[PDB]
């Protein structure tokens, strides 16, 4: 499903209102992993060592890989969504998605396996349309020290990391990770946050199609209280350089403004899915039983 | 009655031909319900929470409980078959028949009440040998997201709903008339075929009951197995099933087998793809319909 702004495409769009954790299953399997490059993965090793010469402190972290997502039959007795996930890493991401030869990898991939992403790490990111009690969406200015989308506008992010029921632990890890990041980066108490709702999955084409799962999260605080909580942490309590707010009523028309050029690809996917899927009621995160 | 597959036993085999709906009566009574477990129904509650953690989409719904069945001599006035039914639920079903203690429950029941099923929920399922105009039986492959027998090949079937006779909810035995219950059993069969195969009701004949088989992996849970004919051919049936794409249904494929092969069906590698309840339907079909 192609959207406007060619930086962004939609892999998954959930039905209206979004989907809760309880209606989602995950399948985590080696069959969902990246395919070994044509040929040899030491090309990844070469890039990793070429970087790391310039930045010796770089560390490789494990990530979930998105292979595919399938919506179930409308109003069915099973889960409404199945996520097929593999394992990948930051090292493989730098060596494939962000490598110069990334364009070569997608063509050879769709040729060989009939899937452009077959030779790409495709780590699954997470993002959130965080809505305030007085109906604003929260945005964050990225610090200029980052190589990816420097100085641009973002939404609260995250990165889940790997640790029947196995699939539910993964589903749980994904949903928990967006709450954990909102608390850490925006400095909000967990009590003030609703249970997240998945809105869909968007692909960043500037990243050669890395997907990001986009969630809706409601905050019981007003836009003024959030800002205070954010600032009260001080410059070192968050890795963004500042926060601001846009009325939910103005979010739909937002792409007319000069702000859209400020937004990073991930945040765009979040806004687009928010406008299309919209929100629905959920209770306090603390009121839901943890697994 | 040993059926020959240790996964299947026959509780009842109908005459003919199979029995039409007009010849069958149901009696509901709280005496046909499950006896309260010695430990308690709290053991059922613990198992329910555990199953929900793995599959949150599971829902508890009321079910008919099969207690027993009795045939009468043909020519006798009134029903030739009486089904004695209780009320149970999907929660009780997972907490008893699919409990790890199931074998221990069947023993306690045998000792105490002289009935292996005494402490088991035993919801009554329905299934259908569905023949097409060009003489194939129809088969469907189960999803992996089901609570039991994931990924196995099955016949059309499902659970009759007591809540269908009294939409008010929380059903009592006195709220459910015998003839309406028998009707719900026969109608749930036709409706399952319509919903999962996307076949029009007008193409389906009135189901004939072949008998009742037990699923020994589910600790003897019983299913009623019906014979139903379709006026459409295998090809047309496949087309109907295919409209809407793979996500039109939760089943993952439709398959056809010649009725002549059905007789020998379990000398074939197809047999090893079948869940127990589908094995029950084939064994009764072969025996009652040929
Ligand atoms: O009350 C219910 C009923 C169904 N489900 C779920 O929806 C699915 C419905 O499957 P269904 O086929 O209707 O019941 P099963 O118990 O899963 O399957 C058994 O019952 C069917 C009809 O009796 C047979 O065809 C199958 O072979 C037999 O395995 C179940 O797996 C469950 O996941 C519930 O959560 N609560």
Tab-separated table of N, CA and C in Angstrom, chain A residues 22-25 27 70-71 73 76-79 82 164-165 168 291, chain B residues 50 53-59 144-145 157 192 246-250:
chain	number	residue	atom	x	y	z
A	22	UNK	N	-3.673	-8.116	23.057
A	22	UNK	CA	-4.405	-9.384	23.217
A	22	UNK	C	-4.930	-9.970	21.915
A	23	UNK	N	-4.985	-9.146	20.877
A	23	UNK	CA	-5.454	-9.603	19.581
A	23	UNK	C	-4.304	-9.826	18.618
A	24	UNK	N	-3.083	-9.839	19.137
A	24	UNK	CA	-1.900	-9.997	18.286
A	24	UNK	C	-1.057	-11.204	18.684
A	25	UNK	N	-0.681	-12.000	17.685
A	25	UNK	CA	0.258	-13.108	17.889
A	25	UNK	C	1.541	-12.845	17.115
A	27	UNK	N	5.177	-14.903	15.595
A	27	UNK	CA	5.910	-16.127	15.310
A	27	UNK	C	7.380	-15.770	15.097
A	70	UNK	N	0.355	-10.341	8.839
A	70	UNK	CA	-0.875	-10.771	8.192
A	70	UNK	C	-2.098	-10.503	9.057
A	71	UNK	N	-2.990	-9.660	8.546
A	71	UNK	CA	-4.295	-9.456	9.146
A	71	UNK	C	-5.183	-10.677	8.944
A	73	UNK	N	-8.882	-12.860	9.003
A	73	UNK	CA	-10.240	-12.570	8.520
A	73	UNK	C	-10.997	-11.643	9.462
A	76	UNK	N	-12.758	-12.511	13.328
A	76	UNK	CA	-12.550	-13.959	13.403
A	76	UNK	C	-12.241	-14.416	14.826
A	77	UNK	N	-12.185	-15.730	15.036
A	77	UNK	CA	-12.064	-16.278	16.390
A	77	UNK	C	-10.623	-16.398	16.886
A	78	UNK	N	-9.665	-16.204	15.988
A	78	UNK	CA	-8.256	-16.249	16.344
A	78	UNK	C	-7.681	-14.850	16.521
A	79	UNK	N	-6.340	-14.735	16.619
A	79	UNK	CA	-5.719	-13.404	16.668
A	79	UNK	C	-6.054	-12.620	15.408
A	82	UNK	N	-1.032	-11.556	12.752
A	82	UNK	CA	0.147	-12.403	12.952
A	82	UNK	C	1.414	-11.713	12.437
A	164	UNK	N	4.332	-20.813	21.343
A	164	UNK	CA	2.999	-20.247	21.564
A	164	UNK	C	3.059	-19.084	22.560
A	165	UNK	N	3.455	-19.392	23.788
A	165	UNK	CA	3.664	-18.363	24.793
A	165	UNK	C	4.879	-17.528	24.367
A	168	UNK	N	3.950	-14.644	22.576
A	168	UNK	CA	3.271	-13.653	23.416
A	168	UNK	C	4.240	-12.855	24.260
A	291	UNK	N	2.406	-10.338	31.805
A	291	UNK	CA	2.597	-11.775	31.616
A	291	UNK	C	3.836	-12.274	32.361
B	50	UNK	N	-3.672	-19.988	32.519
B	50	UNK	CA	-2.484	-20.426	31.806
B	50	UNK	C	-2.690	-20.463	30.284
B	53	UNK	N	-2.870	-16.907	28.766
B	53	UNK	CA	-1.572	-16.250	28.663
B	53	UNK	C	-0.936	-16.540	27.315
B	54	UNK	N	-1.101	-17.775	26.839
B	54	UNK	CA	-0.519	-18.199	25.566
B	54	UNK	C	-1.387	-17.749	24.388
B	55	UNK	N	-2.708	-17.810	24.571
B	55	UNK	CA	-3.674	-17.442	23.531
B	55	UNK	C	-4.783	-16.526	24.061
B	56	UNK	N	-4.483	-15.228	24.260
B	56	UNK	CA	-5.432	-14.256	24.822
B	56	UNK	C	-6.769	-14.143	24.081
B	57	UNK	N	-6.813	-14.559	22.817
B	57	UNK	CA	-8.035	-14.464	22.003
B	57	UNK	C	-9.094	-15.534	22.316
B	58	UNK	N	-8.713	-16.525	23.112
B	58	UNK	CA	-9.646	-17.525	23.595
B	58	UNK	C	-10.805	-16.865	24.323
B	59	UNK	N	-12.011	-17.385	24.119
B	59	UNK	CA	-13.186	-16.893	24.827
B	59	UNK	C	-13.970	-18.052	25.438
B	144	UNK	N	-3.095	-22.748	12.525
B	144	UNK	CA	-2.208	-23.009	13.661
B	144	UNK	C	-2.592	-22.224	14.926
B	145	UNK	N	-3.544	-21.303	14.802
B	145	UNK	CA	-3.940	-20.450	15.927
B	145	UNK	C	-5.133	-21.004	16.714
B	157	UNK	N	-17.000	-28.515	10.499
B	157	UNK	CA	-17.643	-28.738	11.781
B	157	UNK	C	-17.529	-27.550	12.725
B	192	UNK	N	-22.150	-24.131	9.401
B	192	UNK	CA	-20.698	-24.183	9.404
B	192	UNK	C	-20.230	-24.348	7.961
B	246	UNK	N	-7.036	-15.781	0.568
B	246	UNK	CA	-6.662	-16.702	1.652
B	246	UNK	C	-7.139	-16.253	3.037
B	247	UNK	N	-7.403	-14.958	3.188
B	247	UNK	CA	-7.867	-14.396	4.455
B	247	UNK	C	-9.388	-14.313	4.528
B	248	UNK	N	-10.071	-14.872	3.535
B	248	UNK	CA	-11.529	-14.945	3.582
B	248	UNK	C	-11.976	-15.897	4.687
B	249	UNK	N	-11.130	-16.875	4.997
B	249	UNK	CA	-11.423	-17.853	6.037
B	249	UNK	C	-10.192	-18.112	6.870
B	250	UNK	N	-10.403	-18.702	8.039
B	250	UNK	CA	-9.296	-19.041	8.915
B	250	UNK	C	-8.707	-20.408	8.573
